[PDB]
Coordinates of C-alpha atoms in Angstrom, one line a residue:
Chain A
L1 CA 0.0 0.0 0.0
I2 CA 3.1 2.2 0.2
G3 CA 2.4 5.2 -2.1
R4 CA -1.2 4.0 -2.9
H5 CA -4.3 6.2 -2.6
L6 CA -7.4 4.7 -1.1
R7 CA -10.9 6.0 -1.6
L8 CA -12.8 5.1 1.6
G9 CA -16.5 4.9 1.7
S10 CA -18.0 6.2 5.0
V11 CA -20.9 8.2 6.5
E12 CA -21.6 9.7 9.9
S13 CA -22.2 6.8 12.4
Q14 CA -21.5 8.0 15.9
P15 CA -19.2 7.2 17.7
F16 CA -17.5 5.3 14.8
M17 CA -17.5 8.4 12.6
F18 CA -18.5 12.0 13.1
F19 CA -18.7 14.2 9.9
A20 CA -18.4 18.0 10.2
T21 CA -20.5 19.7 7.6
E22 CA -18.5 23.0 7.9
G23 CA -15.4 24.5 9.4
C24 CA -13.0 21.9 8.1
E25 CA -11.4 20.6 4.9
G26 CA -10.9 17.2 3.5
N27 CA -10.0 14.4 5.8
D28 CA -10.1 16.8 8.8
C29 CA -13.9 16.9 8.6
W30 CA -13.9 13.3 9.9
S31 CA -13.3 12.1 13.4
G32 CA -14.2 9.1 15.6
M33 CA -13.1 5.6 16.3
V34 CA -13.0 4.5 12.7
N35 CA -11.2 7.6 11.7
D36 CA -8.5 6.9 14.4
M37 CA -8.2 3.4 12.9
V38 CA -7.8 4.7 9.4
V39 CA -5.2 7.3 10.4
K40 CA -3.1 4.6 12.1
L41 CA -3.5 2.3 9.2
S42 CA -2.3 5.1 6.8
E43 CA 0.7 5.8 9.0
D44 CA 1.7 2.1 9.3
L45 CA 1.0 1.1 5.7
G46 CA 2.0 4.3 3.9
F47 CA -1.1 5.0 1.9
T48 CA -2.9 8.3 1.4
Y49 CA -6.7 8.4 1.5
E50 CA -9.9 10.4 1.3
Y51 CA -13.5 9.7 2.4
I52 CA -16.4 9.4 -0.1
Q53 CA -20.0 9.4 1.1
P54 CA -22.8 7.8 -0.9
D55 CA -25.1 10.4 -2.4
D56 CA -28.0 8.5 -0.9
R57 CA -26.4 8.6 2.6
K58 CA -27.3 4.9 3.2
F59 CA -25.3 2.0 4.5
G60 CA -26.5 -0.4 1.9
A61 CA -29.1 -3.1 1.3
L62 CA -30.2 -5.2 -1.7
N63 CA -33.5 -4.3 -3.1
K64 CA -35.2 -7.6 -4.0
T65 CA -37.5 -6.0 -6.6
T66 CA -34.6 -4.6 -8.7
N67 CA -31.8 -6.8 -7.5
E68 CA -29.7 -3.6 -7.0
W69 CA -27.7 -2.3 -4.1
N70 CA -27.6 1.2 -2.7
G71 CA -25.5 3.1 -0.1
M72 CA -21.8 2.5 0.6
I73 CA -22.2 -1.0 -0.7
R74 CA -23.3 0.2 -4.2
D75 CA -20.5 2.8 -4.3
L76 CA -18.0 0.1 -3.6
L77 CA -19.5 -2.2 -6.3
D78 CA -19.4 0.7 -8.7
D79 CA -15.7 1.2 -8.1
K80 CA -16.2 4.7 -6.6
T81 CA -14.4 3.5 -3.5
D82 CA -11.7 0.9 -2.6
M83 CA -12.8 0.0 0.9
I84 CA -15.7 0.9 3.2
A85 CA -14.3 2.2 6.5
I86 CA -17.2 2.2 8.9
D87 CA -19.0 -0.1 11.4
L88 CA -20.0 -2.4 8.6
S89 CA -22.1 -5.2 10.0
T90 CA -21.6 -8.7 8.6
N91 CA -24.6 -10.3 6.9
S92 CA -25.1 -12.9 4.2
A93 CA -26.8 -10.5 1.7
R94 CA -23.7 -8.2 1.7
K95 CA -21.3 -11.2 1.7
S96 CA -22.9 -12.3 -1.6
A97 CA -21.6 -9.1 -3.2
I98 CA -18.5 -8.0 -1.3
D99 CA -15.9 -9.3 1.1
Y100 CA -15.2 -8.2 4.7
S101 CA -12.0 -7.4 6.4
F102 CA -11.1 -9.1 9.6
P103 CA -13.6 -8.0 12.2
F104 CA -12.8 -5.3 14.8
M105 CA -15.8 -5.5 17.1
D106 CA -18.5 -7.9 18.1
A107 CA -22.2 -6.7 17.9
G108 CA -25.8 -7.8 18.2
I109 CA -29.3 -6.6 17.5
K110 CA -31.0 -4.7 20.3
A111 CA -34.5 -3.2 20.7
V112 CA -35.2 -0.1 22.9
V113 CA -38.2 1.9 24.0
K114 CA -38.9 5.2 25.9
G115 CA -40.9 5.0 29.1
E116 CA -40.7 2.9 32.2
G117 CA -42.8 -0.2 32.7
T118 CA -43.2 -1.3 29.1
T119 CA -45.4 -4.5 28.9
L120 CA -43.4 -5.8 26.0
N121 CA -41.1 -8.8 26.4
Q122 CA -40.1 -9.7 22.8
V123 CA -40.3 -7.7 19.6
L124 CA -42.6 -10.1 17.8
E125 CA -45.3 -9.3 20.4
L126 CA -45.5 -5.9 18.7
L127 CA -47.6 -7.6 16.0
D128 CA -50.4 -8.4 18.4
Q129 CA -51.0 -5.0 19.8
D130 CA -51.3 -1.3 18.8
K131 CA -50.2 0.7 21.9
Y132 CA -46.7 0.8 20.5
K133 CA -45.4 1.6 17.1
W134 CA -41.9 0.4 16.0
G135 CA -39.3 0.7 13.3
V136 CA -35.9 0.1 11.8
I137 CA -33.7 2.4 9.7
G138 CA -34.0 1.6 5.9
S139 CA -31.1 0.1 4.1
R140 CA -29.2 -0.7 7.2
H141 CA -28.2 -4.1 8.7
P142 CA -30.9 -4.6 11.2
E143 CA -33.6 -4.2 8.6
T144 CA -31.7 -6.8 6.4
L145 CA -31.4 -9.3 9.2
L146 CA -35.1 -9.1 10.1
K147 CA -36.1 -9.3 6.4
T148 CA -34.0 -12.4 5.8
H149 CA -34.8 -14.2 9.1
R150 CA -36.3 -17.7 8.7
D151 CA -39.3 -16.6 10.7
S152 CA -41.2 -14.3 8.4
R153 CA -42.9 -12.6 11.3
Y154 CA -39.7 -10.6 11.4
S155 CA -40.4 -9.5 7.8
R156 CA -43.8 -8.5 9.0
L157 CA -42.2 -6.3 11.7
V158 CA -40.2 -4.5 9.0
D159 CA -43.0 -4.2 6.5
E160 CA -45.6 -3.0 9.0
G161 CA -43.2 -0.7 10.9
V162 CA -42.0 2.8 10.3
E163 CA -39.1 3.2 7.9
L164 CA -36.6 5.5 9.5
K165 CA -34.2 7.7 7.5
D166 CA -31.1 7.5 9.7
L167 CA -30.1 7.4 13.4
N168 CA -31.1 11.0 14.1
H169 CA -34.6 10.4 12.7
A170 CA -34.8 7.1 14.7
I171 CA -33.7 8.6 18.1
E172 CA -36.0 11.5 17.6
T173 CA -38.9 9.1 17.1
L174 CA -37.9 7.0 20.0
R175 CA -37.9 10.0 22.3
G176 CA -41.4 10.9 21.1
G177 CA -42.5 7.8 23.1
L178 CA -44.6 4.7 22.4
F179 CA -42.0 3.6 19.9
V180 CA -39.7 0.6 19.8
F181 CA -36.5 1.2 17.9
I182 CA -34.7 -1.9 16.7
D183 CA -31.0 -1.4 15.9
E184 CA -27.5 -2.5 17.0
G185 CA -26.1 -2.8 20.6
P186 CA -23.0 -0.6 20.4
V187 CA -24.8 2.1 18.5
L188 CA -27.6 2.3 21.0
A189 CA -25.1 2.0 23.9
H190 CA -23.3 5.2 22.8
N191 CA -26.2 7.2 21.5
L192 CA -28.7 6.7 24.3
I193 CA -26.4 6.8 27.3
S194 CA -28.1 10.0 28.6
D195 CA -31.7 8.7 28.0
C196 CA -32.4 7.3 31.4
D197 CA -36.1 6.8 30.5
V198 CA -35.1 4.5 27.6
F199 CA -35.1 0.8 28.3
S200 CA -34.4 -2.5 26.5
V201 CA -37.1 -4.6 24.9
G202 CA -36.3 -8.3 25.0
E203 CA -32.7 -9.6 25.0
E204 CA -30.1 -8.9 22.3
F205 CA -30.4 -11.4 19.4
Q206 CA -28.3 -12.4 16.4
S207 CA -24.5 -12.4 16.7
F208 CA -22.3 -10.6 14.1
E209 CA -19.3 -8.4 13.7
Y210 CA -18.3 -5.0 12.6
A211 CA -15.7 -5.0 9.8
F212 CA -14.5 -3.0 6.9
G213 CA -16.0 -3.7 3.4
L214 CA -13.7 -4.8 0.6
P215 CA -14.3 -5.6 -3.1
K216 CA -13.9 -9.2 -4.0
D217 CA -10.3 -9.8 -5.1
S218 CA -9.0 -6.6 -3.5
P219 CA -5.2 -6.5 -3.5
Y220 CA -5.4 -4.8 -0.1
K221 CA -7.4 -7.3 1.9
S222 CA -4.5 -9.3 3.2
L223 CA -2.6 -6.3 4.6
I224 CA -5.7 -4.6 6.0
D225 CA -6.8 -7.8 7.7
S226 CA -3.3 -8.3 9.3
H227 CA -3.2 -4.8 10.6
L228 CA -6.8 -4.9 12.0
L229 CA -6.1 -8.1 13.8
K230 CA -3.0 -6.6 15.3
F231 CA -5.0 -3.5 16.4
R232 CA -7.5 -5.8 18.1
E233 CA -4.9 -8.1 19.7
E234 CA -2.8 -5.2 21.0
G235 CA -5.8 -3.6 22.6
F236 CA -6.0 -0.5 20.3
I237 CA -9.6 -1.2 19.4
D238 CA -10.6 -1.3 23.1
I239 CA -8.7 1.9 23.8
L240 CA -10.5 3.6 21.0
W241 CA -13.9 2.4 22.2
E242 CA -13.1 3.7 25.7
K243 CA -12.0 7.0 24.1
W244 CA -15.0 7.5 21.9
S245 CA -18.0 5.9 23.5
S246 CA -19.8 7.4 26.5
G247 CA -19.4 7.4 29.4
Chain B
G1 CA -13.8 -18.0 -8.6
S2 CA -14.7 -20.9 -11.1
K3 CA -13.2 -23.4 -8.7
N4 CA -15.8 -24.7 -6.2
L5 CA -15.8 -27.7 -3.9
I6 CA -18.1 -30.1 -5.8
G7 CA -16.4 -33.5 -6.1
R8 CA -13.3 -32.3 -4.2
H9 CA -11.8 -34.4 -1.3
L10 CA -10.7 -32.2 1.5
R11 CA -8.1 -33.2 4.1
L12 CA -9.1 -31.4 7.4
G13 CA -6.7 -30.8 10.2
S14 CA -8.1 -31.5 13.6
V15 CA -7.4 -32.9 17.1
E16 CA -9.6 -33.7 20.1
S17 CA -10.7 -30.4 21.7
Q18 CA -13.9 -30.9 23.7
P19 CA -16.7 -30.0 23.0
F20 CA -15.6 -28.9 19.5
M21 CA -14.2 -32.3 18.6
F22 CA -14.2 -35.7 20.3
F23 CA -11.9 -38.4 18.8
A24 CA -12.6 -42.1 19.5
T25 CA -9.5 -44.1 19.7
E26 CA -11.2 -47.5 19.1
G27 CA -14.4 -49.0 17.8
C28 CA -14.7 -46.8 14.8
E29 CA -13.1 -46.1 11.4
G30 CA -12.4 -43.0 9.5
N31 CA -14.7 -40.0 9.9
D32 CA -17.0 -42.0 12.3
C33 CA -14.3 -41.6 14.9
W34 CA -15.0 -37.9 15.1
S35 CA -18.0 -36.1 16.8
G36 CA -18.7 -32.7 18.3
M37 CA -19.7 -29.2 17.4
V38 CA -17.0 -28.8 14.7
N39 CA -17.8 -32.2 13.2
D40 CA -21.5 -31.2 12.9
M41 CA -20.4 -28.0 11.0
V42 CA -18.1 -30.0 8.7
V43 CA -20.9 -32.6 7.9
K44 CA -23.3 -29.8 7.0
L45 CA -20.6 -28.0 4.8
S46 CA -19.8 -31.3 3.0
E47 CA -23.5 -31.8 2.2
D48 CA -24.1 -28.3 1.1
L49 CA -20.9 -27.8 -0.9
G50 CA -20.5 -31.4 -2.3
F51 CA -17.1 -32.4 -1.0
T52 CA -15.9 -35.5 0.7
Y53 CA -13.4 -35.3 3.5
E54 CA -11.1 -37.0 6.1
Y55 CA -9.5 -35.7 9.2
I56 CA -5.7 -35.7 9.7
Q57 CA -4.1 -35.1 13.1
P58 CA -0.6 -33.7 13.4
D59 CA 1.8 -36.2 14.8
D60 CA 2.8 -33.7 17.5
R61 CA -0.8 -33.3 18.6
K62 CA -0.3 -29.5 18.9
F63 CA -2.5 -26.7 17.7
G64 CA 0.5 -24.7 16.4
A65 CA 2.9 -21.9 17.3
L66 CA 6.0 -20.4 15.7
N67 CA 9.4 -21.3 17.2
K68 CA 11.4 -18.1 17.2
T69 CA 14.7 -20.1 17.3
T70 CA 14.0 -22.1 14.1
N71 CA 11.3 -19.9 12.5
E72 CA 9.3 -23.0 11.9
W73 CA 5.7 -23.9 12.8
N74 CA 4.3 -27.0 14.4
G75 CA 0.9 -28.6 15.0
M76 CA -2.0 -28.2 12.7
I77 CA -0.6 -25.0 11.4
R78 CA 2.5 -26.8 10.1
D79 CA 0.5 -29.6 8.5
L80 CA -1.6 -26.9 6.7
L81 CA 1.6 -25.1 5.5
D82 CA 3.0 -28.4 4.3
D83 CA -0.1 -29.2 2.2
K84 CA -1.0 -32.3 4.4
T85 CA -4.3 -30.6 4.9
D86 CA -6.6 -28.0 3.1
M87 CA -8.3 -26.5 6.1
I88 CA -8.0 -26.6 9.9
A89 CA -11.4 -27.6 11.2
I90 CA -11.2 -26.9 14.9
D91 CA -11.6 -24.0 17.4
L92 CA -8.7 -22.2 15.8
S93 CA -8.0 -19.0 17.7
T94 CA -7.2 -15.8 15.8
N95 CA -3.7 -14.4 16.5
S96 CA -1.2 -12.3 14.7
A97 CA 1.5 -14.9 14.6
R98 CA -0.7 -17.4 12.8
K99 CA -2.1 -14.6 10.5
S100 CA 1.5 -14.1 9.2
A101 CA 1.5 -17.6 7.8
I102 CA -2.1 -18.6 7.2
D103 CA -5.6 -17.1 6.6
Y104 CA -8.7 -17.6 8.7
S105 CA -12.2 -18.3 7.7
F106 CA -15.1 -16.1 8.8
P107 CA -15.3 -16.6 12.6
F108 CA -17.8 -19.0 14.1
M109 CA -17.5 -18.0 17.9
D110 CA -16.2 -15.1 20.0
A111 CA -13.6 -16.1 22.7
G112 CA -11.3 -14.6 25.3
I113 CA -8.5 -15.7 27.6
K114 CA -9.5 -17.0 31.0
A115 CA -7.4 -17.8 34.0
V116 CA -8.6 -20.1 36.8
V117 CA -7.2 -21.2 40.1
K118 CA -7.6 -24.0 42.6
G119 CA -6.5 -23.3 46.2
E120 CA -7.6 -22.5 49.7
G121 CA -6.3 -19.5 51.6
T122 CA -5.1 -16.3 50.0
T123 CA -5.9 -16.1 46.3
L124 CA -5.0 -14.0 43.3
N125 CA -6.8 -11.2 41.5
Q126 CA -4.7 -10.8 38.4
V127 CA -2.3 -13.2 36.7
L128 CA 0.8 -11.0 36.9
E129 CA 0.6 -11.4 40.7
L130 CA 2.0 -14.9 40.1
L131 CA 5.5 -13.4 39.5
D132 CA 5.8 -12.0 43.0
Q133 CA 4.9 -15.1 45.1
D134 CA 5.5 -18.8 45.4
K135 CA 2.4 -20.3 46.9
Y136 CA 0.8 -21.0 43.5
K137 CA 2.4 -22.6 40.5
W138 CA 0.9 -21.9 37.0
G139 CA 1.1 -22.8 33.4
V140 CA -0.2 -22.7 29.8
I141 CA -0.3 -25.4 27.2
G142 CA 2.7 -25.3 24.8
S143 CA 2.1 -24.4 21.2
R144 CA -1.4 -23.3 21.8
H145 CA -3.0 -19.8 21.4
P146 CA -2.9 -18.5 25.0
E147 CA 0.8 -19.2 25.2
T148 CA 1.3 -17.2 21.9
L149 CA -0.7 -14.3 23.2
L150 CA 1.2 -14.1 26.4
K151 CA 4.6 -14.4 24.6
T152 CA 3.7 -11.7 22.1
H153 CA 2.1 -9.2 24.6
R154 CA 3.7 -5.8 24.7
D155 CA 4.2 -6.2 28.4
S156 CA 7.1 -8.7 28.7
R157 CA 6.0 -9.7 32.2
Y158 CA 3.5 -12.0 30.3
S159 CA 6.5 -13.6 28.6
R160 CA 7.9 -14.2 32.1
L161 CA 4.7 -16.0 33.1
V162 CA 5.1 -18.4 30.2
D163 CA 8.9 -18.9 30.6
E164 CA 8.7 -19.4 34.4
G165 CA 5.5 -21.5 34.4
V166 CA 5.0 -25.2 33.9
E167 CA 4.8 -26.3 30.3
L168 CA 1.7 -28.3 29.9
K169 CA 1.2 -30.9 27.1
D170 CA -2.5 -30.6 26.4
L171 CA -5.8 -30.0 28.0
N172 CA -5.9 -33.3 29.8
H173 CA -2.5 -32.6 31.4
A174 CA -3.5 -29.0 32.2
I175 CA -6.7 -30.0 33.9
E176 CA -5.1 -32.8 35.9
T177 CA -2.4 -30.3 37.1
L178 CA -5.1 -27.8 38.0
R179 CA -7.0 -30.4 39.9
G180 CA -3.9 -31.2 41.9
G181 CA -4.3 -27.8 43.5
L182 CA -2.3 -24.6 44.2
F183 CA -2.3 -24.0 40.5
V184 CA -3.4 -21.3 38.0
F185 CA -4.2 -22.5 34.5
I186 CA -4.4 -19.8 31.8
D187 CA -6.4 -20.8 28.7
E188 CA -9.6 -19.9 26.8
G189 CA -13.1 -19.1 28.1
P190 CA -15.3 -21.5 26.1
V191 CA -12.9 -24.4 26.6
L192 CA -12.8 -23.9 30.4
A193 CA -16.6 -23.3 30.6
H194 CA -17.2 -26.7 29.1
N195 CA -14.4 -28.7 30.7
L196 CA -14.5 -27.3 34.3
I197 CA -18.3 -27.2 34.7
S198 CA -18.2 -29.7 37.6
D199 CA -15.1 -28.3 39.3
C200 CA -16.7 -26.4 42.1
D201 CA -13.4 -25.7 43.8
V202 CA -12.0 -23.9 40.8
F203 CA -12.4 -20.1 40.7
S204 CA -11.5 -17.2 38.3
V205 CA -8.3 -15.2 38.5
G206 CA -9.8 -11.9 37.6
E207 CA -11.7 -11.0 34.4
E208 CA -11.2 -12.5 31.0
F209 CA -8.7 -10.5 28.9
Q210 CA -7.7 -10.3 25.2
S211 CA -10.5 -10.6 22.7
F212 CA -10.4 -12.9 19.6
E213 CA -12.4 -15.4 17.5
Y214 CA -12.5 -19.1 16.8
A215 CA -12.4 -19.7 13.0
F216 CA -11.2 -22.4 10.6
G217 CA -7.6 -22.1 9.2
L218 CA -7.0 -21.8 5.5
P219 CA -3.8 -21.7 3.4
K220 CA -3.1 -18.4 1.8
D221 CA -4.6 -18.2 -1.7
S222 CA -7.0 -21.1 -1.0
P223 CA -9.6 -21.4 -3.8
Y224 CA -12.1 -22.5 -1.2
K225 CA -12.1 -19.6 1.2
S226 CA -14.8 -17.6 -0.3
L227 CA -17.3 -20.5 -0.2
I228 CA -16.3 -21.6 3.2
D229 CA -16.7 -18.1 4.5
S230 CA -20.1 -17.5 3.0
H231 CA -21.4 -20.8 4.4
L232 CA -20.0 -20.2 7.9
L233 CA -21.5 -16.7 8.0
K234 CA -24.8 -18.2 7.0
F235 CA -24.5 -20.9 9.8
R236 CA -23.9 -18.1 12.3
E237 CA -26.6 -15.8 11.0
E238 CA -29.2 -18.6 10.9
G239 CA -28.4 -19.6 14.5
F240 CA -26.9 -22.9 13.7
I241 CA -23.7 -22.3 15.6
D242 CA -25.7 -21.3 18.8
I243 CA -27.8 -24.5 18.4
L244 CA -24.6 -26.6 18.2
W245 CA -23.1 -24.9 21.2
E246 CA -26.2 -25.7 23.2
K247 CA -26.1 -29.3 21.9
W248 CA -22.5 -30.0 22.7
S249 CA -21.4 -27.8 25.7
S250 CA -22.0 -29.0 29.2
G251 CA -25.0 -27.8 31.1
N252 CA -26.2 -27.8 34.7
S253 CA -23.6 -27.9 37.4
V254 CA -23.5 -29.9 40.6
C255 CA -22.0 -26.7 42.0

């Protein structure tokens, strides 16, 4: 990678990435756990880089009507980027189109709701009531996992729930009350630390990892994988999580 | 790409490693000598991907580590490098030393290092305390992942622990030594959870530390990695791995 330039797909995804929309130039507009990882990779491996956001601002999912991808996944498939540098959750749909790097963090699906004393015990119970509404963010991993789950009642949850634009939209809706937001454990841990009236619905389910995304046959996968494994083994990933997550 | 596994015959590196693999030493032939969580994974892979297989154990019965004197590998890792096997089908822990020589599949299970102790009286809170006392002896299994992590840790006091501890041959030897008392054994969480379930007089030495995965081992440039990875990810996502862990790992506790 010495001398090479990498175009890195990314989007705001706190605390993995924060994107400043003003008052900065180029790479300096980005900060967060993943940015710290990229900076260290670039120092150790000798590449230059830039970040490229998808115009649609989505993570990426496969539309089963059109058989087309969107988001960061689509940008990578279109050769607009060389690697996706974000908390990219591992799922079989994405694996059918792209590779993943060695994983840097474990993660699971988690559901949360505002208001003490929720009667709910498991998310599927939402289908048999109408006190609470619920939703997932469109074109993001949790939606994909629920839509591909063997038990098609999870597809019902997605199809009959609210489609959320992004995390800001989702947390806003959650705080409006009477709404179950289904997303990912680490994301919710960080972003809802101050919401003392927000509680968990059911236990976490599904087990997966966060990794970077790589195009199939990338010449960079071996080195990126080696270096990410080293970061994890040396404790760097933990140190960054402690730095960036609250708290 | 074009190469798939249909009609291939894979040689799979493995050893007994309960509850991932159990190896019967009599009253069986061939693949039927093997059972366990990993065996169930392999059977399913073979059905779905269309390969036949056999298991091959390293003569040294080690998992595999790099000897810094000779710069040579041993164990299942060495057999894989020597083309005696095509894939290591076992709880193969991810570490940087191994990654310099081989690739890993997609991971099937998360794991950490765990230290346990048997002994009455004063006890220990953290493994480095072992260096400043002589009540407890301690050890790790040679040429296995915990030893490698301790030997490669930035803080060379962990290398002291390995160098000054007892070298243990295998899990049977380690657990026998632990059960003999006044001993700290440093190994892996899932392995100890299963194998020490009935040892009510064995306790933890602090929290688990170091984070990693169990995966299968693959040679660099294997034409089979993409397919194996996809299928292992599907097993995980579909809940098959969790079902197998529940099937094979010990439950209850007289304790």
